[PDB]
Amino acid sequence: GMTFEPYPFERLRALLKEITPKKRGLDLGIGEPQFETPKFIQDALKNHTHSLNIYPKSAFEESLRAAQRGFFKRRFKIELKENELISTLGSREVLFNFPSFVLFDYQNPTIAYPNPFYQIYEGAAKFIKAKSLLMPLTKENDFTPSLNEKELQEVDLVILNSPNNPTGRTLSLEELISWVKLALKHDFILINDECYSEIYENTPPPSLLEACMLAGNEAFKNVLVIHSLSKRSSAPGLRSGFIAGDSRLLEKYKAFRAYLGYTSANAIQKASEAAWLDDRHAEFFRNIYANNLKLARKIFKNTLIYPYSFYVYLPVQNGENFAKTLYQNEGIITLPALYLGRNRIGADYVRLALVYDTPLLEKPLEIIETYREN
Template sequence: MLFQPYPFEKLQELIKDIRPNKPLFKLTIGEPQFPTPQNIQDAFKESSELLRFYPSTKGESYLYESIQDFLSYRYNLNLDSKQIIPTLGTREVLFNFPQFLLSEITHPTMAYPNPFYQVYEGASIASKSKVFLMELNQDNNFKPSLSIEQMKQVNLVILNSPNNPTGATLSKEELKQWVQYALEYDFVLLNDECYSEIYQDTPPAGILEASYELGNKDFKNILSINSISKRLSAPSLRSGFIAGDAEILKNYLTYRTYLGVAMPTPLQKTASIAWKSHKIAQEIRKKYADNLKLAQQIFTTTPIYPFSFYVWLYVRDELSFCKKLYEKEGILVLPGSFLGRNNAGKGYVRIALVYDTPTLKPILETIATFLQKGEF
């Protein structure tokens, strides 16, 4: 199998000979710069004695209860434990689930947005799948779509709403339409919802609530994944889940026992505290909301959606812009072309709004001024 280098590897190659003139600010990776809440840190310390136990691949009951609590709080959905699998973050799911799902299909086909989170592509390579790239661009408001002929062929469609890197988000009605397509053309529909908890005012819709309201209450063919990483500034906790169609998840859980992806028991215990920390999560969300508002005020000609924490900024020559901004101002952003194929993302850079607002303000102002001058 031949995999493309990850975007951050390409970035390091791009800037390897550059020595910036100023202190470094990294706005490349979606890594929260806010401290992990104290209650989660305390829970982690207090759970260390659980290291003496082998972790369960299935997951402990208290973790299921906390994820169920989150789904009830966030989407007013009461899922059975058979409709949920706790996971070791979500990247591993996005990589190994397609391999599981498509393993017995002779000529499997996947579809996912372009540009994309690169693990989608890795999964398609590992599962030897044909791929339909759903192009995201300004002309279609960065919304994914497939033709009827493509939907007749596809076995697995991965959506990503709210979207990384564009921030564009599908409405509940748009998600319902995708659910209808999944049922009508009998493909599995998975929505990567890792940015669902970062928004300004109104929370984005989820694929499971769309499915339920449409009448597909058993979530046939429908799955959602999510993670605690952004919601509680805890990416190293590696707590995520996949939820939805119990018939699919039953066999997938058996498959997972062979993968060695059991979440360490102290992390399961800590995560069970984190998933229930709704008030603290709202406090963190408001910080990102302030950052989004700030970005909207500074980049007035760029569509910045009130979801996720990225700015998808058009700069014309993204490679030169990235190198010169890094050299002259010590600010590192990610070229959009590193996130897509067939020129998707070309001309854009992705900016992660992960610092506190006072720190971020002069950085974004510097980027806006640098762009306006056009000296790159």
């Protein structure tokens, strides 16, 4: 059988179980937006309920795929071909099952991903019985992942996450270009979990497919990017995402997906389509997250906060102890980064999820700083 490790929220619940907060404070643990779904998205759903009698297609509707491609064009200035994008039921399932698809017939497969990480990457490796090569992200090299020469020759699949959960670290165009060249040189599959690409403060982060265009890999050979609508549009219930890149791998993945049953109501797909076609509402939410990061940066003195994602990777003496103290005294919930990593990576940090409207964060963030400062 497979091993079922506890999830970060269970480890946190366990840590705080013996504590009764002396005050009421904000929950900055869970990275899930606290905003209403835009009305026009809801109205699209309401206006198409009649399609509930239609068995949805595993490929999703053509109109949704086209809306997703249009998004990629406007956002990354790349015109994806029809066989270069597959519609998916959010990103979670794709991140979990794509590796079992691509490494299906491999003997002793090896997957690389950063440390700390969104735990689904490890689940994915366990499901295909792969060896995991963890690329630590620490301050010693400005949270930069790398592999040595032997590792580059052994690895079969590399998963990056840029912008990164939980550090916010975002790889530059030049950094992504190096990875593309390594993927082509050593012949391994390279994926970027790009679910935070619309959560940024100033300059938009680059897609790994842009690196492909500039590295002479316009066909996106060995390379794929995974996107989701959940954070961008405050509509996680729609379960809409996509995977774009290598058309040879995607054409085979399409056939595999016929069997999986990851389908959604046509009415849900219409609302997803309306969301992907519009940029206004996305910008409205991005601006709030932009202002959250700015506020945090003013408050947490001499702390590095990258202008991407909606997280703060906060240095503390011990994350677990800091979480306990803050909850006990202020009722403010934070996530020790230890619970997102292996080999004790994250021990000196708590992750903060700035998922509230900016004015609600001013007080709690100041309070947090008072417990941290000298």
